[PDB]
Design a protein around this motif. Structure first.
Motif, PDB file in Angstrom:
ATOM      1  N   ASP A 205      44.691  30.495  48.733  1.00 42.56           N
ATOM      2  CA  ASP A 205      46.157  31.002  47.570  1.00 42.56           C
ATOM      3  C   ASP A 205      45.659  30.495  46.577  1.00 42.56           C
ATOM      4  O   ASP A 205      45.934  31.466  45.421  1.00 42.56           O
ATOM      5  N   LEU A 206      44.847  29.304  46.701  1.00 44.20           N
ATOM      6  CA  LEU A 206      44.204  28.870  45.397  1.00 44.20           C
ATOM      7  C   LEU A 206      43.358  29.646  44.582  1.00 44.20           C
ATOM      8  O   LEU A 206      43.787  30.058  43.078  1.00 44.20           O
ATOM      9  N   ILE A 207      42.315  30.315  45.523  1.00 38.46           N
ATOM     10  CA  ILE A 207      42.029  31.901  44.803  1.00 38.46           C
ATOM     11  C   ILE A 207      42.092  32.893  43.802  1.00 38.46           C
ATOM     12  O   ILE A 207      42.473  33.408  42.632  1.00 38.46           O
ATOM     13  N   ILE A 208      43.315  33.079  44.513  1.00 34.57           N
ATOM     14  CA  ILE A 208      44.628  34.529  44.473  1.00 34.57           C
ATOM     15  C   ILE A 208      45.199  33.587  43.097  1.00 34.57           C
ATOM     16  O   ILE A 208      45.654  34.548  41.833  1.00 34.57           O
ATOM     17  N   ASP A 209      46.283  32.704  43.443  1.00 32.89           N
ATOM     18  CA  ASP A 209      47.366  32.328  42.513  1.00 32.89           C
ATOM     19  C   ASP A 209      46.368  32.163  40.690  1.00 32.89           C
ATOM     20  O   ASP A 209      47.169  32.204  39.328  1.00 32.89           O
ATOM     21  N   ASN A 210      44.966  31.544  41.120  1.00 34.03           N
ATOM     22  CA  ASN A 210      44.443  30.532  39.948  1.00 34.03           C
ATOM     23  C   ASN A 210      44.042  32.031  39.202  1.00 34.03           C
ATOM     24  O   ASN A 210      44.738  32.398  37.413  1.00 34.03           O
ATOM     25  N   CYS A 211      43.906  33.266  39.544  1.00 30.42           N
ATOM     26  CA  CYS A 211      43.307  34.295  39.149  1.00 30.42           C
ATOM     27  C   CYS A 211      44.621  34.887  38.810  1.00 30.42           C
ATOM     28  O   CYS A 211      44.852  35.162  37.708  1.00 30.42           O
ATOM     29  N   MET A 212      45.959  34.907  39.387  1.00 26.41           N
ATOM     30  CA  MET A 212      47.119  35.768  38.762  1.00 26.41           C
ATOM     31  C   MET A 212      47.377  34.730  37.324  1.00 26.41           C
ATOM     32  O   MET A 212      48.610  35.238  36.442  1.00 26.41           O
ATOM     33  N   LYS A 213      47.272  33.528  37.016  1.00 25.88           N
ATOM     34  CA  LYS A 213      47.690  33.020  36.122  1.00 25.88           C
ATOM     35  C   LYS A 213      46.898  33.526  34.497  1.00 25.88           C
ATOM     36  O   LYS A 213      47.250  33.505  33.303  1.00 25.88           O
ATOM     37  N   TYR A 214      45.663  32.567  35.295  1.00 29.90           N
ATOM     38  CA  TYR A 214      44.890  32.941  33.953  1.00 29.90           C
ATOM     39  C   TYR A 214      44.150  34.100  33.248  1.00 29.90           C
ATOM     40  O   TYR A 214      44.242  34.491  32.114  1.00 29.90           O
ATOM     41  N   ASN A 215      44.403  35.443  34.275  1.00 32.19           N
ATOM     42  CA  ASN A 215      44.048  36.569  33.642  1.00 32.19           C
ATOM     43  C   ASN A 215      45.122  37.717  33.920  1.00 32.19           C
ATOM     44  O   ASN A 215      46.404  37.377  34.428  1.00 32.19           O
ATOM     45  N   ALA A 216      45.540  38.264  32.611  1.00 35.36           N
ATOM     46  CA  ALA A 216      46.746  38.993  32.140  1.00 35.36           C
ATOM     47  C   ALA A 216      47.197  40.000  33.460  1.00 35.36           C
ATOM     48  O   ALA A 216      45.669  40.826  34.521  1.00 35.36           O
ATOM     49  N   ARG A 217      48.032  41.029  33.731  1.00 37.96           N
ATOM     50  CA  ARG A 217      48.242  42.068  34.532  1.00 37.96           C
ATOM     51  C   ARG A 217      47.345  42.981  34.882  1.00 37.96           C
ATOM     52  O   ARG A 217      47.084  43.935  35.450  1.00 37.96           O
TER      53      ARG A 217
ATOM     54  N   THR B 177      44.170  43.900  33.810  1.00 40.58           N
ATOM     55  CA  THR B 177      43.000  43.518  34.416  1.00 40.58           C
ATOM     56  C   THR B 177      42.292  43.945  35.696  1.00 40.58           C
ATOM     57  O   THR B 177      43.237  43.655  36.759  1.00 40.58           O
ATOM     58  N   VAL B 178      40.913  43.730  36.193  1.00 41.25           N
ATOM     59  CA  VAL B 178      40.887  44.402  37.120  1.00 41.25           C
ATOM     60  C   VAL B 178      40.238  43.171  37.544  1.00 41.25           C
ATOM     61  O   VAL B 178      40.605  43.117  38.861  1.00 41.25           O
ATOM     62  N   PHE B 179      40.331  41.491  36.755  1.00 40.50           N
ATOM     63  CA  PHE B 179      40.661  40.284  37.900  1.00 40.50           C
ATOM     64  C   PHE B 179      41.782  40.552  38.538  1.00 40.50           C
ATOM     65  O   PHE B 179      42.222  40.159  40.011  1.00 40.50           O
ATOM     66  N   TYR B 180      42.859  40.792  37.756  1.00 43.10           N
ATOM     67  CA  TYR B 180      44.067  40.619  38.125  1.00 43.10           C
ATOM     68  C   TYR B 180      44.019  41.066  39.340  1.00 43.10           C
ATOM     69  O   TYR B 180      44.898  40.353  40.892  1.00 43.10           O
ATOM     70  N   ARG B 181      44.055  43.150  39.088  1.00 41.77           N
ATOM     71  CA  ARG B 181      44.203  44.029  40.338  1.00 41.77           C
ATOM     72  C   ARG B 181      43.886  43.048  41.476  1.00 41.77           C
ATOM     73  O   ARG B 181      43.887  43.823  42.729  1.00 41.77           O
ATOM     74  N   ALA B 182      42.297  42.466  41.591  1.00 41.51           N
ATOM     75  CA  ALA B 182      41.407  42.225  42.688  1.00 41.51           C
ATOM     76  C   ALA B 182      42.136  41.419  43.196  1.00 41.51           C
ATOM     77  O   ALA B 182      41.982  41.856  44.614  1.00 41.51           O
TER      78      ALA B 182
END
Length: 121
Positions: free
Chosen positions: A79-91, A93-98
């Motif tokens: 869950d930290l992997i996912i949640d960190n990414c969804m905060k740092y990156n904007a909606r 982005t390829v990162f958020y979407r991944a």
């Protein structure tokens, strides 16, 4: 004692099951966006944003040291992997979407792992 050995065998078997879970989750990240820690050389301000970084390589180290006592602990790190990414990156982005795709697809894998851990004790 024999009890300490039996407990060690339970931890070993949990570790085997969590290793298969981790492999299945990581296949849901074919782009390898979550494979390694975010580089503090390339994102020097990251720790100002994200207080508890996490990634699959770091989980694998903890796993192989039998550092997960139960599924809840392992799930916390996923869950930290996912949640960190969804905060740092904007909606947008390829990162958020991944992360969204990993969360959605991982949910299935984790739903049955919970049953396998309750079932096999």
């Amino acid at each position: 004692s024999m009890e300490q050995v039996a407990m060690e065998l339970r931890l070993t078997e949990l570790t085997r099951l969590l290793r298969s879970v981790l492999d299945q989750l990581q296949d849901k990240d074919p782009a390898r966006i979550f494979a390694q820690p975010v580089s503090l050389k390339e994102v020097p301000d990251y720790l100002d944003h994200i207080k508890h970084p996490m990634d699959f390589a770091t989980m694998r180290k903890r796993l192989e040291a039998q550092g997960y006592k139960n599924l809840h602990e392992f799930e916390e790190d996923f869950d930290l992997i996912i949640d960190n990414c969804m905060k740092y990156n904007a909606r947008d982005t390829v990162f958020y979407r991944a992360a969204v795709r990993l969360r959605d697809q991982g949910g299935v894998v984790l739903r049955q792992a919970r049953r396998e851990v309750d079932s096999i004790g």
